[PDB]
Design an enzyme around this catalytic site. Sequence first.
Site: not given
Ligand SMILES: N[C@@H](Cc1ccccc1)P(=O)(O)C[C@@H](Cc1ccccc1)C(=O)N[C@@H](Cc1ccccc1)C(=O)O
Ligand SMILES: [Zn+2]
Length: 610
Positions: A271, A295-296, A299, A318, A375, A383
């Site tokens: 985001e 989602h983005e 944010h 989240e 990480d 989430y």
């Molecule tokens: N701030 C970003 C999260 C982030 C990035 C770096 C360090 C800390 C935190 P962020 O924007 O939610 C990314 C999110 C985006 C997202 C999440 C849920 C639904 C749709 C999109 C996403 O990429 N998660 C993965 C799959 C996944 C979901 C949940 C938990 C683990 C893995 C994916 O989609 O590969």
């Molecule tokens: Zn997110």
Amino acid sequence: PEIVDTCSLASPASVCRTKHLHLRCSVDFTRRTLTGTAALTVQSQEDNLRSLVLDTKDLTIEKVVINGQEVKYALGERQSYKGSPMEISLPIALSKNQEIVIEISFETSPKSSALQWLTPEQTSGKEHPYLFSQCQAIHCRAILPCQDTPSVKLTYTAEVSVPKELVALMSAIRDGETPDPEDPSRKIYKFIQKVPIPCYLIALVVGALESRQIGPRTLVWSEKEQVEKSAYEFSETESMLKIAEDLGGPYVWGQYDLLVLPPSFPYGGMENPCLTFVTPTLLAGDKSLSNVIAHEISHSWTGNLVTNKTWDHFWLNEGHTVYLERHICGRLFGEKFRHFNALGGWGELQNSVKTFGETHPFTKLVVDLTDIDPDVAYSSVPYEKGFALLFYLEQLLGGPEIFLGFLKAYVEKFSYKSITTDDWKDFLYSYFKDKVDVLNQVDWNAWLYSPGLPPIKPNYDMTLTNACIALSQRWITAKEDDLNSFNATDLKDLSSHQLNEFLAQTLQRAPLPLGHIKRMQEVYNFNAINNSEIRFRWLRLCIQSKWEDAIPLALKMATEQGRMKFTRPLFKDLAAFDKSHDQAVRTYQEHKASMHPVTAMLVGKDLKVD
Ligand SMILES: N[C@@H](Cc1ccccc1)P(=O)(O)C[C@@H](Cc1ccccc1)C(=O)N[C@@H](Cc1ccccc1)C(=O)O
Ligand SMILES: [Zn+2]
Ligand SMILES: [Yb+3]
């Protein structure tokens, strides 16, 4: 309350606060280094302040200048993933609220955990190299010295010198481009971010980029080969932004552009303000993976405006974003569809709790990240446990329209601030003071601080989920003599989302007999589906069910793209299958050097190698 950021070695916000960063740097692709100066405008929050400490990780400090003179600084001992603290001796003691500018000359390491440097052969165009950053959570300190804590918010300006054949973009409004006054083979791109942000939202990409306009405030950026497909894939972005503004209030960031990264990008999206980053695995051809953009976009309120004070409170970022994301989808596709996604999210929460174990500290909503690399702890828990709590409260407090009024008010109350779970809860009790009796029924301690599944499962409409469950159970309960009855017509009334949920349901009960999986390919031809989410689940189902034919397909997907959601479990499944274990380990070893640093580290840990 005494809340420190245990992931930062910098002076805390109670000591001094960065107000602004002016970044002047040059991207050196031959050396794989970013070089230049970060001038931090810093305000003392204390009387008689004479030193301060900044976060750094693998940075080379040439010098630090204040009032035109070099000042003493010292780098402390590395504290593993937190990096090394940089103590700066101020030349004159500062009074409370006094502001000074500290200019730090620095250079990054080629192994910066924030950065991926890509050779021309790792790009679509094959001519030029490419660079992208990923600062969240605590990688900004691997790009520049800073107070690398989301408790601090700053504005920024930047000038980035790059080979002239290439384009620089940042999480900021584009502010012009010129030939580089000190090298006519280079261009300088300028940037301005006028809304204060935590440093984890600083982002930079450098590559052979083109753009296409797709809405009144949106361009899509990618390499030339991906532009046409991206414009179509994301053509619903302006509609979603309108619905988001209805839910959350004005969009304050100006531009909402999208950048489609090369395949090694570790996340589905990121985001970064003004410039959301997305994986090209979203380019399904039919816009079916647009919830990532929802989602983005969300944010831009929850995360970027109202920010977690420390990473322990990550679920505030989240959980609320998921909650907003699912409302955009519900407005666009109906309330039964929002319940479908919410129900799916509960299944993901079951998967993550099953995988960590029901007493593991990472399954807690509020986590304690002292001496834990964020990480490593990263999972679906904040989430889906966060969303579940919000969905439970929605149902407790009178429904979606009522609860969305709380959300808009929450965003107004805390815009431009960084907050803790106790701030959220205090405001929740303020907002719903006429329903405190209802609130007091909530088992706060279980929900916020106990590990495992939540103490209460919300109510979910099952309408769109039933056909998935029914087909999954038919396959699970089938015997050899039942396989004949399956036929491609089984799938005719399922959306791509329902097919994905069919595979998720079945995957939860994996392994299935090898004959069942072969029949499924024979009748459904899942091997032909290009949609990355469906293909990922099908390949896991095949590998967990021990089908050797699937080994090369699984290795190819694990290595040809780098989205961790896909690459990590595919590598783990391949390592757990005796027939592919040696090949998994060998393939990791071979590709590791050209993988994203964070992805390489985690897959390595997953396989127990290096
Ligand atoms: N701030 C970003 C999260 C982030 C990035 C770096 C360090 C800390 C935190 P962020 O924007 O939610 C990314 C999110 C985006 C997202 C999440 C849920 C639904 C749709 C999109 C996403 O990429 N998660 C993965 C799959 C996944 C979901 C949940 C938990 C683990 C893995 C994916 O989609 O590969
Ligand atoms: Zn997110
Ligand atoms: Yb039978």
